[PDB]
Amino acid sequence: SLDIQVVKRGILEGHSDWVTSIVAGFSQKENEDSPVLISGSRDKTVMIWKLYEEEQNGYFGIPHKALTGHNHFVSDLALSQENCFAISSSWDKTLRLWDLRTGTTYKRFVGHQSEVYSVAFSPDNRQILSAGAEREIKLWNILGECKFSSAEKENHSDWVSCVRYSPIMKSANKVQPFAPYFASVGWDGRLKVWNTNFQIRYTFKAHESNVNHLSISPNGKYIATGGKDKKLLIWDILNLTYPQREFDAGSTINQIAFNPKLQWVAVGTDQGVKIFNLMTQSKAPVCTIEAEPITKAEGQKGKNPQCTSLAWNALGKKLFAGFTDGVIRTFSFETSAN
RNA sequence: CAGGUUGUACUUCUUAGAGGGACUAUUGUGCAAUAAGCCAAUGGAAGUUUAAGGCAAUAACAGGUCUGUGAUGCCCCUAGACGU
Numbered sequence: 040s041l042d043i044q045v046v047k048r049g050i051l052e053g054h055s056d057w058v059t060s061i062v063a064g065f066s067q068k069e070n071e072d073s074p075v076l077i078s079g080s081r082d083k084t085v086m087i088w089k090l091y092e093e094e095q096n097g098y099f100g101i102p103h104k105a106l107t108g109h110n111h112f113v114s115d116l117a118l119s120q121e122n123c124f125a126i127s128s129s130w131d132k133t134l135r136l137w138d139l140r141t142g143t144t145y146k147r148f149v150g151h152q153s154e155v156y157s158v159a160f161s162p163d164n165r166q167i168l169s170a171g172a173e174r175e176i177k178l179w180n181i182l183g184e185c186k187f188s189s190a191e192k193e194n195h196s197d198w199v200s201c202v203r204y205s206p207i208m209k210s211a212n213k214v215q216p217f218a219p220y221f222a223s224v225g226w227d228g229r230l231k232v233w234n235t236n237f238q239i240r241y242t243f244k245a246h247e248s249n250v251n252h253l254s255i256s257p258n259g260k261y262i263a264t265g266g267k268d269k270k271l272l273i274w275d276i277l278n279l280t281y282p283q284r285e286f287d288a289g290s291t292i293n294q295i296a297f298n299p300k301l302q303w304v305a306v307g308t309d310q311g312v313k314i315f316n317l318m319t320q321s322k323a324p325v326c327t328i329e330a331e332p333i334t335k336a337e338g339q340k341g342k343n344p345q346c347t348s349l350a351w352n353a354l355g356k357k358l359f360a361g362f363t364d365g366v367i368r369t370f371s372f373e374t375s376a377n
Numbered sequence: 378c379a380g381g382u383u384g385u386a387c388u389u390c391u392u393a394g395a396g397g398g399a400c401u402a403u404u405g406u407g408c409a410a411u412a413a414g415c416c417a418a419u420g421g422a423a424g425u426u427u428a429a430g431g432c433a434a435u436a437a438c439a440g441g442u443c444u445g446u447g448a449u450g451c452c453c454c455u456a457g458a459c460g461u
């Protein structure tokens with residue numbers, strides 16, 4: 040057997056409610072570690088984390104700055120390439136541009152109506168993409184001006200849950216055969232793929248229930264898609280009649296993340312976090328349910344927390360799961376190969 | 378520590394418009410024949426129907442009001458008038 044076992048790293052706490060979004064630093068000079076962690080939660084707060092080198096006590100790190108601009112929950116965060124800037128989606132019908140050194144909000148994006156579930160940052164950093172319960176995807180100048188809004192003929196029924204982008208690698212030698220696209224996942228169970236011009240390129244009806252999250256392989260060759268359908272769908276951008284691969288992950292799918300290198304898929308689920316190996320065909324490579332540190336409070340027992348977010352650090356060695364109890368948990372992997 | 382001034386300044390305090398927010402939320406081998414519900418702890422600005430009120434069905438009670446009304450039936454007073 041190839042055993043992939045998990046060493047517990049630590050605990051990042053001080054998030055009052057849920058942990059809805061997590062981003063880790065971009066690798067700046069190549070193959071070097073990311074010092075930076077940012078989370079977003081219900082709690083009305085965006086947390087900036089100063090991370091311990093080793094692990095002291097049971098903790099992996101300590102809260103540095105708490106960004107407060109927001110009325111309702113923070114749905115999703117995205118980083119600039121600079122790593123010096125972050126953005127916040129919210130149910131408060133607004134987006135925010137955050138300087139990461141100062142607590143300062145730079146500009147805020149206004150003009151969304153209902154509420155905002157997700158945001159994406161384009162590789163050029165001059166385009167912001169935002170989506171919400173308006174069944175609408177919006178394109179913003181970094182100066183805070185709505186540039187475009189996808190219309191009825193294209194846009195999908197119910198709510199856009201998540202929008203993301205299609206990475207173009209640095210070297211041209213990294214083999215980019217396709218066109219640039221952006222992907223939109225929704226509560227109608229539709230995975231959409233649009234060109235830069237906001238023209239529908241490929242819209243497949245992926246799921247039977249609703250889709251909470253979508254992420255793109257670092258290669259931009261495949262898409263991972265998931266929600267209440269209790270199914271993890273992987274799609275080849277070459278042949279779409281049939282989904283590339285499918286996995287059964289217990290109960291409901293909250294989040295999905297690709298290992299920036301390692302070629303695994305981590306899935307946030309109510310039961311816990313599952314990790315899939317794409318290099319072999321088997322259905323459950325590493326499974327983590329987490330008992331509650333808040334349960335250690337005497338007399339109150341948990342049903343377990345459910346994990347509301349995932350992120351990998353740039354090196355792909357560390358993994359962060361945001362939870363129901365407002366605690367981020369950190370885990371590392373040791374390989375024992377028989 | 379106090380005044381006086383000031384600005385392509387600002388919203389914590391102050392107005393008060395928009396919109397949030399609480400649904401008994403979360404947890405509970407707590408009581409419930411596990412159903413309505415109650416209870417506790419935690420979080421929470423707020424968990425006594427959040428608090429205090431407005432409105433008030435069917436029916437009555439020959440309740441009160443001709444002295445609130447230029448709403449009136451009938452009765453009475455009409456030039457030393459019960460009129461002004």
Ligand SMILES: [Mg+2]
Nearest residue numbers: 426428429430
């Ligand atoms: Mg009342």
Ligand SMILES: [Mg+2]
Nearest residue numbers: 438439440441
């Ligand atoms: Mg009488």
